[PDB]
CSV table of C-alpha atoms and ligand atoms in Angstrom, one decimal:
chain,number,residue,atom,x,y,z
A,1,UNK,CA,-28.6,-3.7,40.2
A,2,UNK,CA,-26.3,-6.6,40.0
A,3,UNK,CA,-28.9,-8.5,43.0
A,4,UNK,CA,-31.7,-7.8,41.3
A,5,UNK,CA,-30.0,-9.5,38.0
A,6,UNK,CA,-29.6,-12.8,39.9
A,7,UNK,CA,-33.2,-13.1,41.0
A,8,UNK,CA,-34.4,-12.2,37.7
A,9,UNK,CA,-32.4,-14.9,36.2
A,10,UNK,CA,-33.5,-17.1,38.9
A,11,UNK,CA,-36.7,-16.2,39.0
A,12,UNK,CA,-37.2,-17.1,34.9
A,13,UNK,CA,-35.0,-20.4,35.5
A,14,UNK,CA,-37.8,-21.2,38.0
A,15,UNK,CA,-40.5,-20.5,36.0
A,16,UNK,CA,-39.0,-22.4,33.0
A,17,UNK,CA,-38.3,-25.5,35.1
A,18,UNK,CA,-41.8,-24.9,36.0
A,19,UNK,CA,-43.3,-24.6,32.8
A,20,UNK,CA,-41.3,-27.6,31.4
A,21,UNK,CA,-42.9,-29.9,34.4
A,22,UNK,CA,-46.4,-29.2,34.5
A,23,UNK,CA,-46.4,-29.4,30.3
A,24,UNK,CA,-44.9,-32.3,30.6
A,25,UNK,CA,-46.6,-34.2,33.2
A,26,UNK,CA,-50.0,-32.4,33.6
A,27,UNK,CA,-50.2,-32.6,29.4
A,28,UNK,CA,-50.6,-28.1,29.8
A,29,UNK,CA,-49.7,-26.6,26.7
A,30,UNK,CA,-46.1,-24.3,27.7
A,31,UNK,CA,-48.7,-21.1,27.9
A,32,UNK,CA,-50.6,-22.8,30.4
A,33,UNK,CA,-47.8,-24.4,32.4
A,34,UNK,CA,-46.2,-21.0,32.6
A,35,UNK,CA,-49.5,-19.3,33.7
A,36,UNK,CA,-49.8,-22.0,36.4
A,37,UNK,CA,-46.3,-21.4,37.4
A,38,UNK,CA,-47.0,-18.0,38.1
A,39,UNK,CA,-50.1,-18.0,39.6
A,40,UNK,CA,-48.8,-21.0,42.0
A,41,UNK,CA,-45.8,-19.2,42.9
A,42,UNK,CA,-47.2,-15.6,43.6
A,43,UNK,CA,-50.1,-17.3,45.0
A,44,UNK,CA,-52.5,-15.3,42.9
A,45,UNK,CA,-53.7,-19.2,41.9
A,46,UNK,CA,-56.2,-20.7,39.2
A,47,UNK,CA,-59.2,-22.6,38.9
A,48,UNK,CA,-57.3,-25.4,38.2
A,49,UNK,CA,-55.3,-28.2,40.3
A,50,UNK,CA,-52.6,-30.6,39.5
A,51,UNK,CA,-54.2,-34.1,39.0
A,52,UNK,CA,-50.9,-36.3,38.8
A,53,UNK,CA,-49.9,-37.4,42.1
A,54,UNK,CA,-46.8,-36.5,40.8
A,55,UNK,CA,-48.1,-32.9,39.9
A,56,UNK,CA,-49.4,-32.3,43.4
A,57,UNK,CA,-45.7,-33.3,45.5
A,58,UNK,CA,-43.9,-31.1,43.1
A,59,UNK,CA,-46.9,-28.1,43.2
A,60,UNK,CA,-45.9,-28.5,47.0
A,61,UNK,CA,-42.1,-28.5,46.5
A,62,UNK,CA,-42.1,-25.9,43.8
A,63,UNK,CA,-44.5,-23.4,46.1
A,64,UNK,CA,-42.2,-23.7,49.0
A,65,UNK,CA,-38.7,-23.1,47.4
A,66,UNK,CA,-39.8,-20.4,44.3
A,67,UNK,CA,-42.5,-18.8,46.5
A,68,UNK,CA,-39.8,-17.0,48.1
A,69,UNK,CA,-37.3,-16.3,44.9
A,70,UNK,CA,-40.8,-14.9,43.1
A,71,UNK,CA,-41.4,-12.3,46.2
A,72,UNK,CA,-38.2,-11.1,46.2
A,73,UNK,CA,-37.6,-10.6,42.7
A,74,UNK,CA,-41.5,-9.1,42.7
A,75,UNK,CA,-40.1,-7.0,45.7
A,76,UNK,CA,-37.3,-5.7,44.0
A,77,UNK,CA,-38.8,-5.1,41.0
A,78,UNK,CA,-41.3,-3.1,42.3
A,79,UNK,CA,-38.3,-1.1,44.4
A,80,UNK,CA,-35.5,-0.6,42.2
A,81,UNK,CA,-37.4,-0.3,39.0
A,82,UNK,CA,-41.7,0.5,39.2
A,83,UNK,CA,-42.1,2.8,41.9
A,84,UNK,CA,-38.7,5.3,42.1
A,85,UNK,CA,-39.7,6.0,38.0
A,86,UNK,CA,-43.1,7.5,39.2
A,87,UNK,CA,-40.9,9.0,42.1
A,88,UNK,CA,-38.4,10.6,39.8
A,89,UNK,CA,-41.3,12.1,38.0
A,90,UNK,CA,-42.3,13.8,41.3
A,91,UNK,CA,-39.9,16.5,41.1
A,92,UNK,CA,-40.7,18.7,38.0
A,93,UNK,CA,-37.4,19.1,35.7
B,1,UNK,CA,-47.7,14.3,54.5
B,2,UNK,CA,-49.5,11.2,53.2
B,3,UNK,CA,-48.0,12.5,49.6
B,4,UNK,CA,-45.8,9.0,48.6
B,5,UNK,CA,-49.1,7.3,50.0
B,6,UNK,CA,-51.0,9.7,47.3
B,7,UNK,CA,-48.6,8.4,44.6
B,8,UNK,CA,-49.5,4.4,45.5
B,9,UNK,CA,-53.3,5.4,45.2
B,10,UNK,CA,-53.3,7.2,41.9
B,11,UNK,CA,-50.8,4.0,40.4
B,12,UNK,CA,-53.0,1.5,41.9
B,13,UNK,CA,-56.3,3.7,40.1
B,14,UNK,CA,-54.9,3.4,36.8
B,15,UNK,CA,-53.8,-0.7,37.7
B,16,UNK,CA,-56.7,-1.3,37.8
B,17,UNK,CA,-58.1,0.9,34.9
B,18,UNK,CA,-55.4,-0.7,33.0
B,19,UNK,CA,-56.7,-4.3,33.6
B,20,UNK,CA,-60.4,-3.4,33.6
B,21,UNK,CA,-59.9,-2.2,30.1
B,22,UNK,CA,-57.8,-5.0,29.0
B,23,UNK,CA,-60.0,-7.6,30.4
B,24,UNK,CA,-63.3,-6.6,29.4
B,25,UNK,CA,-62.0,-6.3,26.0
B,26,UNK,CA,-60.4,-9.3,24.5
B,27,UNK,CA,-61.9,-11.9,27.8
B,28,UNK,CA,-65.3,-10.4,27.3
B,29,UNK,CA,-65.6,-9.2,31.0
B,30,UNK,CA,-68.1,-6.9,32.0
B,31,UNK,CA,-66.3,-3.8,33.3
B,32,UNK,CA,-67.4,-4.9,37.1
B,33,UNK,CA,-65.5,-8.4,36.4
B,34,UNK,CA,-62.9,-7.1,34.4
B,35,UNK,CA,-62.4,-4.7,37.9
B,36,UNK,CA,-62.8,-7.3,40.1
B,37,UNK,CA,-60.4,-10.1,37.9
B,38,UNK,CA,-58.1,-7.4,38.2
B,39,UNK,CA,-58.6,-6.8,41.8
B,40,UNK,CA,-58.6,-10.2,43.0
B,41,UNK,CA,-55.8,-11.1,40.9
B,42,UNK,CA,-53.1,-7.6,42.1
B,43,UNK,CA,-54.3,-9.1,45.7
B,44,UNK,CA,-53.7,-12.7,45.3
B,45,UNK,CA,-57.0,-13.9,46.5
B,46,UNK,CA,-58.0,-14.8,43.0
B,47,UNK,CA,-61.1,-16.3,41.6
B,48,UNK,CA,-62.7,-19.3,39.9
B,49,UNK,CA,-62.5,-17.8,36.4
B,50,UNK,CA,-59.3,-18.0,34.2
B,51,UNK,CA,-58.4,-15.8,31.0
B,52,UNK,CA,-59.2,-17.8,27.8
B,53,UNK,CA,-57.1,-16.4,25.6
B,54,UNK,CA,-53.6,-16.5,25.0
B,55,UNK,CA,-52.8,-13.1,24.9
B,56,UNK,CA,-55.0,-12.7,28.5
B,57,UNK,CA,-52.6,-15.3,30.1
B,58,UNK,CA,-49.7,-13.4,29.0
B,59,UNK,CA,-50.8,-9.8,30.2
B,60,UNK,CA,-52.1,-11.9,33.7
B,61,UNK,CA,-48.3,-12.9,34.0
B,62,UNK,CA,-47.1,-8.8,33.6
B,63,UNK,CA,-50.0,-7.5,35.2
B,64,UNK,CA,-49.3,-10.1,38.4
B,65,UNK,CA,-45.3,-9.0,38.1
B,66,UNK,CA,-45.7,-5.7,37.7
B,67,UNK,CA,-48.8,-4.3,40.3
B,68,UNK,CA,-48.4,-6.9,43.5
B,69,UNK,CA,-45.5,-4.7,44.3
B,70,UNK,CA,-47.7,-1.3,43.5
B,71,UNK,CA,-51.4,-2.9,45.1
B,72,UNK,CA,-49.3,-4.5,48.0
B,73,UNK,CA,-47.2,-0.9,48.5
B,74,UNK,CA,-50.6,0.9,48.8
B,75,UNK,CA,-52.0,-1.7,51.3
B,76,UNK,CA,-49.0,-1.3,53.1
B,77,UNK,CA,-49.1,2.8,53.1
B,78,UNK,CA,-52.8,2.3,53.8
B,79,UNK,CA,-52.6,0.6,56.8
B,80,UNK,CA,-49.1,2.9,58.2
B,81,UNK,CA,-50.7,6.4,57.4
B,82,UNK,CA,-54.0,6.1,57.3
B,83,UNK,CA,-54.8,2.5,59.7
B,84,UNK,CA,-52.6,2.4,62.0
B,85,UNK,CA,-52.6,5.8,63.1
B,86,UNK,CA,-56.7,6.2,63.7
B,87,UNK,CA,-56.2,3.2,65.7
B,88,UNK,CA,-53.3,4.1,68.0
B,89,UNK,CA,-54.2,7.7,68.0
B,90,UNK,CA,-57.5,6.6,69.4
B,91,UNK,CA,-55.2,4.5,72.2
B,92,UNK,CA,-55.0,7.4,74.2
B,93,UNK,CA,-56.9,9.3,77.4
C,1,UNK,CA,-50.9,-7.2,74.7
C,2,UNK,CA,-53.5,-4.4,74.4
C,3,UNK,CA,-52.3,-3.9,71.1
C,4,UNK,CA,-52.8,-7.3,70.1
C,5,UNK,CA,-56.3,-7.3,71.5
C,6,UNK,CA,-57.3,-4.5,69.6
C,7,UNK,CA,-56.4,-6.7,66.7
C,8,UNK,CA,-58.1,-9.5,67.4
C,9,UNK,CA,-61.6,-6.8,68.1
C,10,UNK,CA,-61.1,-5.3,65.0
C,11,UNK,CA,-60.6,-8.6,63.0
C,12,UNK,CA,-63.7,-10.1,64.8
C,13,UNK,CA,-65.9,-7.3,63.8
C,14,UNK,CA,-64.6,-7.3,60.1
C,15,UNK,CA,-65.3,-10.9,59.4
C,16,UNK,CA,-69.0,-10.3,61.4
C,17,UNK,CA,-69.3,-7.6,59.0
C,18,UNK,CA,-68.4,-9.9,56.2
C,19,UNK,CA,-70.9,-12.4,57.1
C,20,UNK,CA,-73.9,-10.4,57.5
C,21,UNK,CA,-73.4,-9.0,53.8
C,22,UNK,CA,-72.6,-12.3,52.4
C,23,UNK,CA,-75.2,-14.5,53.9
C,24,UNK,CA,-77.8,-11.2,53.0
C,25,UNK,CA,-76.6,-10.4,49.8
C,26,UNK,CA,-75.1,-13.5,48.4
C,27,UNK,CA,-77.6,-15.7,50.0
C,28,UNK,CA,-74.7,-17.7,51.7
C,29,UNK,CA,-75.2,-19.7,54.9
C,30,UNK,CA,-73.6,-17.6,57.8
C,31,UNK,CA,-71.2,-20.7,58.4
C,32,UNK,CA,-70.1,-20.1,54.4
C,33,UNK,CA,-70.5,-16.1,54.4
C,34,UNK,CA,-67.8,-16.1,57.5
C,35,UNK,CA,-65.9,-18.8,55.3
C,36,UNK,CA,-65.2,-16.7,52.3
C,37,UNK,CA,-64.8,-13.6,54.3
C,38,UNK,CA,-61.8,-15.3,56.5
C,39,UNK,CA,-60.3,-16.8,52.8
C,40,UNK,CA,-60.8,-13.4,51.6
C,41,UNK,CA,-59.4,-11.5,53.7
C,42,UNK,CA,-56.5,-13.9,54.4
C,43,UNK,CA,-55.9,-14.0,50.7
C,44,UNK,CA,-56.4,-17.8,50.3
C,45,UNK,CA,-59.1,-17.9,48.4
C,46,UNK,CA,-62.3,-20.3,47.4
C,47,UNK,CA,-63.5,-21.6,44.5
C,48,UNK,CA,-67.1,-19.4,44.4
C,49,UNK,CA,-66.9,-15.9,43.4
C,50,UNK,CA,-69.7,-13.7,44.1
C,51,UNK,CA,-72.7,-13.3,42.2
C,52,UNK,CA,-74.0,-9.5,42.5
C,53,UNK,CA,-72.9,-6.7,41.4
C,54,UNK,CA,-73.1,-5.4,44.8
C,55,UNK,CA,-71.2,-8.4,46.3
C,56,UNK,CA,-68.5,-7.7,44.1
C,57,UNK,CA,-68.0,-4.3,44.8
C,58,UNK,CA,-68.3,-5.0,48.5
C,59,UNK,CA,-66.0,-7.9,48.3
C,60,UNK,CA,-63.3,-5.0,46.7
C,61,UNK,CA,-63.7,-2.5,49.3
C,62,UNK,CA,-63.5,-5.1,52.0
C,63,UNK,CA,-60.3,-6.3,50.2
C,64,UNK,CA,-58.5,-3.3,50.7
C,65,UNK,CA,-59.7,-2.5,53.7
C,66,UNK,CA,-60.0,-5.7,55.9
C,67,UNK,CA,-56.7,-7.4,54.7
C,68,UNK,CA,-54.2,-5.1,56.4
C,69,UNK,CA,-56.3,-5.3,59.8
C,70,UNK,CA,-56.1,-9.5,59.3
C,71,UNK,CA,-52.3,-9.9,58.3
C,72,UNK,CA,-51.6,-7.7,61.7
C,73,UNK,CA,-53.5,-10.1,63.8
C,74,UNK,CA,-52.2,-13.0,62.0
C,75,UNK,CA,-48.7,-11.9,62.4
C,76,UNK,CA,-49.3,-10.6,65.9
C,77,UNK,CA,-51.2,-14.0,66.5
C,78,UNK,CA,-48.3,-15.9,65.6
C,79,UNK,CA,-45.6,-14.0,67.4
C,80,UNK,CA,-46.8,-12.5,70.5
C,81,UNK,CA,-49.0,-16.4,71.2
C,82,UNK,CA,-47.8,-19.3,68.9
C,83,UNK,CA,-44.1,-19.6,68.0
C,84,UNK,CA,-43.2,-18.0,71.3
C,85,UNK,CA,-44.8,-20.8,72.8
C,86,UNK,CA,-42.9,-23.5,71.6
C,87,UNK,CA,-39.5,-21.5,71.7
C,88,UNK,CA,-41.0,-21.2,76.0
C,89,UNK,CA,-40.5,-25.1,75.1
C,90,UNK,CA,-36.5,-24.6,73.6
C,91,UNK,CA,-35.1,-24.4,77.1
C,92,UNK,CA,-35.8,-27.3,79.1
C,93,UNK,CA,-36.9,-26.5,82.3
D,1,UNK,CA,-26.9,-21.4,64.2
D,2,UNK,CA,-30.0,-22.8,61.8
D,3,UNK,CA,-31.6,-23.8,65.1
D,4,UNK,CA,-34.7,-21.1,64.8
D,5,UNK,CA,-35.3,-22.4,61.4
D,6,UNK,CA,-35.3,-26.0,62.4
D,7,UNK,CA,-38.6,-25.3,64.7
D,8,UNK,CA,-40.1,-23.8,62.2
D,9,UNK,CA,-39.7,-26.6,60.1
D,10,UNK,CA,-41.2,-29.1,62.8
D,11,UNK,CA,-43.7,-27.0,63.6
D,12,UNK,CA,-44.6,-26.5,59.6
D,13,UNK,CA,-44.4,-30.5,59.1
D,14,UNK,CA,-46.5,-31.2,62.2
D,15,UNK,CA,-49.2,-28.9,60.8
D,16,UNK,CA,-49.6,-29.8,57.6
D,17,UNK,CA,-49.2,-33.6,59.5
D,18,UNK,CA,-52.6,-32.2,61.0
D,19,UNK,CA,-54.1,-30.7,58.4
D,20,UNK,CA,-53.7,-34.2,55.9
D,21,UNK,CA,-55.4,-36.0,58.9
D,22,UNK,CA,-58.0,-33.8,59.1
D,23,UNK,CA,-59.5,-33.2,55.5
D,24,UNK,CA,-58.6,-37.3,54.6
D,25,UNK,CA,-60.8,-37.9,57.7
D,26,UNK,CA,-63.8,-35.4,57.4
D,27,UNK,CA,-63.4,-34.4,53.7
D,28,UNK,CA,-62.9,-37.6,52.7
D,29,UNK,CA,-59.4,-36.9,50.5
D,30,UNK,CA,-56.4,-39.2,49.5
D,31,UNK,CA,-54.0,-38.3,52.3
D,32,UNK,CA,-52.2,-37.0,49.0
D,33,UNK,CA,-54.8,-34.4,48.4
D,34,UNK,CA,-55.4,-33.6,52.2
D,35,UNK,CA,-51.6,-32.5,52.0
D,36,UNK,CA,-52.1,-30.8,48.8
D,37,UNK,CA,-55.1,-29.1,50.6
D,38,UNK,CA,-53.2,-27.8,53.2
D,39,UNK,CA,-50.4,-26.8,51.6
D,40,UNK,CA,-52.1,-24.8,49.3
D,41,UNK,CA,-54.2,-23.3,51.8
D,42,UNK,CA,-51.3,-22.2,54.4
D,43,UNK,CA,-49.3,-20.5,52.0
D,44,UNK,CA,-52.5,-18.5,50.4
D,45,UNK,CA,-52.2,-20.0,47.0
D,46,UNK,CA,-55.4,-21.7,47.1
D,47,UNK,CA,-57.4,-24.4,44.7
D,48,UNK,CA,-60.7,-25.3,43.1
D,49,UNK,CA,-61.7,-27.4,46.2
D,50,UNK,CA,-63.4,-26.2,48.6
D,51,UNK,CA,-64.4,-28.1,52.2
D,52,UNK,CA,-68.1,-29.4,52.1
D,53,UNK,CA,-68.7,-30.2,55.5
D,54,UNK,CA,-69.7,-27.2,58.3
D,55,UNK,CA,-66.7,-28.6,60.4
D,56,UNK,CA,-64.6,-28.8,57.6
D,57,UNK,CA,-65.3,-25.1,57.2
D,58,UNK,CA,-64.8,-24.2,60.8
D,59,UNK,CA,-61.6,-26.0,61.3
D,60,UNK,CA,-60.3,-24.5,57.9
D,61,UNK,CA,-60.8,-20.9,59.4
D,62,UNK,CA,-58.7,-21.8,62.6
D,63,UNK,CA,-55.9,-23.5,60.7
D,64,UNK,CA,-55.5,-20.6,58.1
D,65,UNK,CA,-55.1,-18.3,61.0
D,66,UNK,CA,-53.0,-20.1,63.3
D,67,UNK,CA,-51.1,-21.8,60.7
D,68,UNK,CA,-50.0,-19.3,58.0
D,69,UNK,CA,-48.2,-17.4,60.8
D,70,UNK,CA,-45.8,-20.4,60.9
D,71,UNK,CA,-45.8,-21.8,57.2
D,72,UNK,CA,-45.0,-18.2,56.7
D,73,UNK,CA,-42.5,-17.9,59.4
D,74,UNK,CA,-40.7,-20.8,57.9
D,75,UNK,CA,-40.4,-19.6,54.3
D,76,UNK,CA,-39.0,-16.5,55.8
D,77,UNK,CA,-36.5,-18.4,57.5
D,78,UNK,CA,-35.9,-20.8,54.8
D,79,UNK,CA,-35.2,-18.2,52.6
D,80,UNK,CA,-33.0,-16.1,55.3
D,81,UNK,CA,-31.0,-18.9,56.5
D,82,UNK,CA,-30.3,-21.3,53.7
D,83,UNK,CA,-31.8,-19.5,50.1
D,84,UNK,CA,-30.5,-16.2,51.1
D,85,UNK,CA,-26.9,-17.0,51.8
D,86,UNK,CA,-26.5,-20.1,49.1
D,87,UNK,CA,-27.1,-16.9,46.7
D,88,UNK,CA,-24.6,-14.4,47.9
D,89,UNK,CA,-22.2,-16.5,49.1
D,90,UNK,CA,-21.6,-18.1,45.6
D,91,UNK,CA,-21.9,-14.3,44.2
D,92,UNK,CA,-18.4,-13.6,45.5
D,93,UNK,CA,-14.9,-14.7,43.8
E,1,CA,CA1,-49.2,-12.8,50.6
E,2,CA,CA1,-58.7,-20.0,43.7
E,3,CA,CA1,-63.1,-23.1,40.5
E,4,CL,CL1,-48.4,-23.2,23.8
E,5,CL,CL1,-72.2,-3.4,32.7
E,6,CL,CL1,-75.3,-21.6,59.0
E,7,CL,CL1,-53.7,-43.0,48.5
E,8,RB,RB1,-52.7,-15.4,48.1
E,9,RB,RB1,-55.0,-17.2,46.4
């Protein structure tokens, strides 16, 4: 779905903005950085916290404007892709 | 009919087979950790512990993408065919 | 609203529930025991996780089962009470 | 319109306004923290810190349930009224 194209390119954009800052200014290796931009943006979260001041104002900013880009793209890609295969295999061919 | 709500149960099962398997194996969970990691995580409440392994962080990231949607569907079908009717249905003379 | 009382009975008796099995099986404080069941249950999350094997098999069953009933209060709490409030506040009497 | 969304907005930035007073007070956080605290804690993502003091842990309960109602409430605007249609609107000719 065209839609659901733009919030996976979104959503990756996100997490690569995401990964780049906290590697950057929280020292995480890119692994780690992209880990804690998931698990911050699904809210899943991590054992860890930002220790930059820095780190904790853009934890804040980043949770409020991906949070919602991650749910939908989560949303769709639970709706137009995940659960209609298992649906499809419902009816036996 | 609770048959789609069937469908989210037996997906949500093997979820969390999937990540019971995979994290008592290469984190070193016991199988009742590497359930509740998996549980915890495919809800969002998450937990104090972190995979230590680079491979774990990576399956975290699928396994987050892929089965919010599916735990979060069942929840949802949990509490419209199965929750909320006992309730309301015990709402009455 | 009767429905929204019904909420609030059920979500009182699940998080009395999940203090008497914390502070007796986890050992917790009832003040902490009511404490991780409302960041349970409300996804948040702590920084403990439980210790026996029987806490964390309780704490999954409760997951599923206690999150759907808490999200409908808190989403019933917030619009039949709080943001209607303020909006009472929009006109200017 | 964008008149909803702007009480949500107050109402979110008073909040989290009362939450940074609270936990610097009691808790003893930088304000910076505090914020951090209650940002993380509205929107379900959650850190490593936990409060230490029995009001701390009483007041915590209260604000997660009247307060993720409208943190939520906001990112649901924010994403209906200004992420939503900054998207489509630029996925035209
Ligand atoms: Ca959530
Ligand atoms: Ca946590
Ligand atoms: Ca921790
Ligand atoms: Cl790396
Ligand atoms: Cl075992
Ligand atoms: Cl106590
Ligand atoms: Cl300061
Ligand atoms: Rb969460
Ligand atoms: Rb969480």
């Amino acid at each position: 779905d065209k839609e659901f194209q733009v919030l996976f390119v979104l959503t990756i954009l996100t997490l690569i903005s995401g990964t780049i800052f906290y590697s950057t200014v929280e020292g995480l290796r890119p692994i780690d950085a992209l880990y804690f931009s998931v698990v911050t943006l699904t809210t899943v979260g991590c054992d860890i916290s930002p220790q930059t001041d820095f780190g904790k104002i853009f934890t804040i900013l980043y949770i409020f404007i991906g949070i919602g880009l991650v749910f939908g793209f989560i949303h769709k890609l639970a709706v137009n892709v995940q659960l209609p295969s298992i649906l499809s295999n419902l009816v036996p061919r």
